[PDB]
């Protein structure tokens, strides 16, 4: 039997899908998402690591002109200085007085820790949601992994479930992403080859093992101080350290809808957005024949207490008249109330108690038990506790139904006021018709 | 790595006041679980008290290295939701303010337009029935219409 | 805790003496046996139990 | 959960305070004053014998 | 209340009775270790100072 519902994509909500095949006892399939993961696609444009400013030991040559060729090494700066007179501990380096020449070399490479510590940039598009759904019906209670999109089908106790695409294509990750060890950020990182010094991206490379390397860290190396051998270099410090210190507020503490981002298969977990449409094809062997299920007659429902708390704060009792003891589905056809219990026990005594969670001042819903319907109109009073540590167990619907004390007053006022208004129209019509002739 | 001591929590109406007591500087990052994050991250180095809003969608606070703790806010409000239009108005005002005020304003406006339109129709009927009798030389104004509608007190 | 529904009160005897001189019988329909609180919202009467 | 009642200051009266947190079965909390002492402050201006 | 002024309370200097809510939530020992972990709101008297 092909059936199709939509469940809220909120972790922990017990969704009670009511399946009514005529000629069979209705079956309630309770499914809830234990965890959901939203993994975006990756591209790995480049990486950025702490850099090492390697400068070799200078060549201070004794009175001969030396000039170095610019070899293709990252941000190479090679320069020749005239008139150096290096002095080492024992004494002057070269006897010849003024014609000594210094050749100073400077280049930058990836740090020796680049493989371990590196923030890697990506572009992200689409998002494949992958969830774990715990299904429960009859005597089958199993948690299965489902790629939530119209493709993946999962068979659980003979029933086949397709979990359709999310109603909303929202993703927490914007187009451009950067990822450090544990946290993720969304920022417009510079494209390859256009990194300004100092800011993020001063040192860039494709892969963690690629030998290419592009860097403009401003190695404007300068003239040595007189009478001492060294290579003075000035250079803006590593952009990674700067980006470390002024990251900005990471997405782990910004993510809308309160999902947690993990890192290694970078992903956003438990994002409470939208609806998952589910289509279920169930075999005949999972249902219960009418002939082998209790028949409920003259079911009338009254609500004992009604406190629209987040937890299952309402209790109603069903009075009925059965024929054999047995258990059967119970479910509230409107999302104004959600019943904690899915399968209710029916004894010969016409009384079964159920707990329902609501959010409306006047929740009116038709509760269905073992193929018979009854209506239940309640009157909830608000809870006094303010902060509680569990998520809402009711779909947040608030509009009270007509015949609730609140809108019944509006009905009465409107009816009376309008009645006097239509009486005014009646008298005006009467007088104008009397006058017309 | 240490775990900072768990803060005392004082519950309020759609806000929660925490009382944070570090022994060494710690992060305190709070975010709401809704469309707009309303995030805030702050180092704390001295004992402070901080009020953080907890909308009905939910809030999550992360103190030091403890696991984040999620608190949600129930539909608490002031006023009885089932007695006399005054208490129901209060109930809705507490639950969703600035929308029920729109609702009551609109309902009251519609009621005023209904009342005024009906009364204008009534006075128009008064005219349409009495003006044929004020333009006649002889102010008869038979007492049937004289009582049924307030009569102009014609002056013989 | 037991859930009580359709509760109708009839006063058996009413003798407003200083002691507990009134007895009222409460009819109801419960769902499980248990103890639960009883209290009169007005100070016109005070219940011993 | 904060509740605020008033009880008459008469020794022996069983006062039945009704506490109702919605979402829980109401609890009736009964209190009675067994003895109340009103101790004035003193000054001992003098003594006579 | 813990942390604020009045974490410890005592009628007199030498009195024996004592009221304290310092939130002593002793926790599970780490594996392979004898100790007694306790997370406690620091003394409210130093906060008041
Ligand atoms: C041993 O020491 C002597 C003494 O300095 C070195 O002789 C030097 O040889 C260079 C070779 O070119 C001379 O440099 C030239 O000088 C002229 C005039 O200034 C200049 O126009 C050229 O462009 C070039 O620079 C240098 O003058 C000369 N030294 C002196 C004092 O005359 C010799 O090279 C040293 N040999 C070794 C193996 O160290
Ligand atoms: C379906 O089976 C799972 C398998 O354990 C049950 O889940 C656990 O139930 C125990 C019972 O006390 C709890 O202590 C665990 O915390 C539950 N685990 C999880 C991950 O929630 C589950 O309860 C079963 N279904 C029903 C209706 O009992």
Automatic annotation (TrEMBL), chain D:
Superkingdom per UniProt: Viruses
Cell compartment(s), UniProt: Host Golgi apparatus, Host trans-Golgi network; Host cell membrane; Host cytoplasm; Host endoplasmic reticulum
Description of how the protein assembles with itself and partners: Oligomer. Interacts with spike glycoprotein E1. Interacts with spike glycoprotein E2. Homodimer. Homomultimer. Interacts with host karyopherin KPNA4; this interaction allows the nuclear import of the viral capsid protein. Interacts with spike glycoprotein E2. Interacts with host IRAK1; the interaction leads to inhibition of IRAK1-dependent signaling.
Function according to Swiss-Prot or TrEMBL: Acts as a viroporin that participates in virus glycoprotein processing and transport to the plasma membrane, cell permeabilization and budding of viral particles. Disrupts the calcium homeostasis of the cell, probably at the endoplasmic reticulum level. This leads to cytoplasmic calcium elevation. Because of its lipophilic properties, the 6K protein is postulated to influence the selection of lipids that interact with the transmembrane domains of the glycoproteins, which, in turn, affects the deformability of the bilayer required for the extreme curvature that occurs as budding proceeds. Provides the signal sequence for the translocation of the precursor of protein E3/E2 to the host endoplasmic reticulum. Furin-cleaved E3 remains associated with spike glycoprotein E1 and mediates pH protection of the latter during the transport via the secretory pathway. After virion release from the host cell, the assembly protein E3 is gradually released in the extracellular space.
Protein's recorded name: Structural polyprotein
């Amino acid at each position: 039997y092909e059936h199709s519902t939509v469940m809220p994509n909120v972790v922990g909500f017990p969704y009670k899908a009511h399946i009514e095949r005529p000629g069979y006892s209705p079956l309630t399939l309770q499914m809830q998402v234990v965890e959901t993961s939203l993994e975006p696609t990756l591209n790995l444009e480049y990486i950025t690591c702490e850099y090492k400013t390697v400068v070799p030991s200078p060549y201070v040559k004794c009175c001969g002109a030396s000039e170095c060729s610019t070899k293709e090494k990252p941000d190479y700066q090679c320069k020749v200085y005239t008139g150096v007179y290096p002095f080492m501990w024992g004494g002057a380096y070269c006897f010849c007085d003024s014609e000594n020449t210094q050749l100073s070399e400077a280049y930058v490479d990836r740090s020796d820790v680049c493989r371990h510590d590196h923030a890697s940039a990506y572009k992200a598009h689409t998002a494949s949601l992958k969830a774990k759904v715990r299904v429960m019906y009859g005597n089958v209670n199993q948690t299965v992994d489902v790629y939530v999109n119209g493709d993946h089908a999962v068979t659980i106790g003979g029933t086949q479930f397709i979990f359709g695409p999310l109603s909303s294509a929202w993703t927490p990750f914007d187009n451009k992403i950067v990822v450090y060890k544990d946290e993720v950020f969304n920022q417009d990182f510079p494209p390859y080859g256009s990194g300004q010094p100092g800011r993020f991206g001063d040192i860039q490379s494709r892969t963690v093992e690629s030998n290419d390397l592009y860097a403009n860290t401003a190695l404007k190396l300068a003239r040595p101080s007189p009478g001492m051998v060294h290579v003075p270099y000035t250079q803006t410090p590593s952009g990674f350290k700067y980006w470390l210190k002024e990251k900005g507020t990471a997405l782990n503490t910004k993510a809308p809808f309160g999902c947690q981002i993990k890192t290694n298969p970078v992903r956003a977990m438990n994002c409470a957005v939208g609806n998952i449409p589910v289509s279920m094809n169930l075999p005949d062997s999972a249902f219960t024949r009418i002939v082998e299920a209790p028949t409920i007659i003259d079911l009338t429902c009254t609500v004992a207490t009604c406190t629209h708390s987040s937890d299952f704060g309402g209790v109603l009792t069903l009075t009925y008249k059965t024929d054999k003891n047995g258990d059967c589905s119970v479910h509230s056809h409107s999302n104004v109330a959600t019943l904690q219990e899915a399968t209710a026990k029916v004894k010969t005594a016409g009384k079964v108690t159920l707990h329902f969670s609501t959010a409306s001042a006047s929740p009116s819903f038709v509760v269905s038990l073992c193929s018979a319907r009854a209506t239940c109109s309640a009157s909830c009073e608000p809870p006094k506790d303010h902060i509680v540590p569990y998520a809402a167990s009711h779909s947040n619907v608030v509009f009270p139904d007509m015949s609730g004390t609140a809108l019944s007053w509006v009905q009465k006022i409107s009816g009376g006021l309008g009645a006097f208004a239509i009486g005014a129209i009646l008298v005006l019509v009467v007088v104008t018709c009397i006058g017309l002739r | 790595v240490p775990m900072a001591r768990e803060p005392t929590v004082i519950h309020g109406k759609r806000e929660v006041t925490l009382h944070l007591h570090p022994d060494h500087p710690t992060l305190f990052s709070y975010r709401t679980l809704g469309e707009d994050p309303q995030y805030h991250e702050e180092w704390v180095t001295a004992a402070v008290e901080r009020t953080i809003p907890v909308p009905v969608d939910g809030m999550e606070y992360h103190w030091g290295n403890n696991d984040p703790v999620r608190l949600w806010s129930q539909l608490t409000t002031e006023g009885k939701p089932h007695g006399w239009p005054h208490q129901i108005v209060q109930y809705y005002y507490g639950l969703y303010p600035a929308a029920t005020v729109s609702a009551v304003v609109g309902m009251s406006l519609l009621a005023l337009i209904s009342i005024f339109a009906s009364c204008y129709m009534l006075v128009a009927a008064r005219s349409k029935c009495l003006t044929p009798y004020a333009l006649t030389p002889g102010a008869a104004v038979p007492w049937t219409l004289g009582i049924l509608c307030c009569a102009p007190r014609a002056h013989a």
